[PDB]
Amino acid sequence: SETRTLQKIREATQELLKYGLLEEASKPNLYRIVLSHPEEVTRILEPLDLDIGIDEIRGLLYVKVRLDETPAQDEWAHPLVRRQRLNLEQSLLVAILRQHFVAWEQESGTGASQAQIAIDDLLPQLQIYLGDPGSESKERTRLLTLLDQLKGHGLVTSPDAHERIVIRPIIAHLADPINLQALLAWLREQIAQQT
Amino acid sequence: KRMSEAKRVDTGALVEAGADLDDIPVYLQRLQELTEEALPEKLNRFLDYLNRSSDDGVTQLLSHIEHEVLVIEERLNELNETMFRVDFQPDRYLRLDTKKVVHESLRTLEKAQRQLNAARFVDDNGESHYKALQVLVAQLRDASERNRTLGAKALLDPRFRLEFAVSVMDRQSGNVIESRTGSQGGSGGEKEIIASYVLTASLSYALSPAGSRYPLFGTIILDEAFSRSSHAVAGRIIAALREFGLHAV
């Protein structure tokens, strides 16, 4: 009797809401389905106070909090974005991963979603900032905790049998140069407060 | 013309620019930046530093392998000390020894290291040193790639640098008539007893905490090596096993 949204559209929208993002490289069918009715998906998100960005160059479709009247204080207050706010150690690791991601992008162009890094390369980097407790196992545990928390936000695949991970393309949009300037201005503010 | 010439060698900077008047600005901007970097001036310094650092790495690694070989050679003396205690035949005790493997890969490494050491003195801004270092690192990388081949193990695996030999010694004198090396002899019973005996001695030495000649964990497990052995040689096996302080199953 009443209208039913295309069952495939329902599948795609619910799946994208579940995982928060959707990549052609591993889920092409739903990715294309959304790309076939982007108006429909956007309308579906409007009640949720959500929105859908696009990046066809790397093959990502990611959710983002709507901004029609959203408080500019922080979109994180939205009741349905369940994962918690990012923090500045996670932000330092995010910056390192973003630098590696852009380096890989230059190397292979947009290439494939496989922008990989060996975990052993991260340890020298964070060592400089978070310190050096002198116990390789302790620093590795700290690094893996940070990486797991980042995967909670969906920016890196968990460690695998080769101790390698793939920086998810979503990283490019979280460390968008505009967001980078915002965070950088706030970080300069805090450095001034350090006085 | 020269704008196009510059593009022929560019990598990652002039890509965004054409080859005409409007592009001259960015060309000269990057020329200014490149000259500011002053990188081309470092050439000889960095070449010599690379030579030094990679030489240090390569020589240290090779000497480390040689010292591993010496450690193994001393382990042989330790086990020989253990084996002198017990008899293999009534008037004889077993002893070990090692020869130095002669192989193509190790010989090539020797030649390349000779050239490398000869290449330090050549007053050539370190070019010949770099050539020798490149060929030696080529050998190392080749070996590390095809590790299962005999040459790769002969180079990077310490123990394969040596050939193991076993002999039977006169209790009262240095007299020796026996050798299991090069040509094994293929004896269908003697090889088995020899292997079991040497293995028991080594296993006892490993099992015995330092200083003590008696194993702390006396138990050992064995199998149809006896079936391959005759009655007399099997009895020799049991006698040797008991004499080394081993209780067995």
Partner: protein
Amino acid sequence: MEENTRQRTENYISAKNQHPAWILLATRRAPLVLSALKTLFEKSHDGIPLEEAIQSLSSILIEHVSQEQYDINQDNPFLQASRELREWIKRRLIVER
């Protein structure tokens, strides 16, 4: 040479406050820790595997339960050995790799 004299007390003030060895010699519990650590590293030169090190340490500390004049673990010596290894890593006495 007197300039070195004036500057030197800065060096010794810093070391007494900062350098690991001097701080260790200063602490009330110095002799027990030093004896145990010497015992551990003495009998091997390759660097102890952490599990072996902590087991040997929990064995050593048990010998010193007779030394009631300093801390005795009442219930779980292994936990005590693990805690002491953590602590001595924290003081940069032992770095593990």
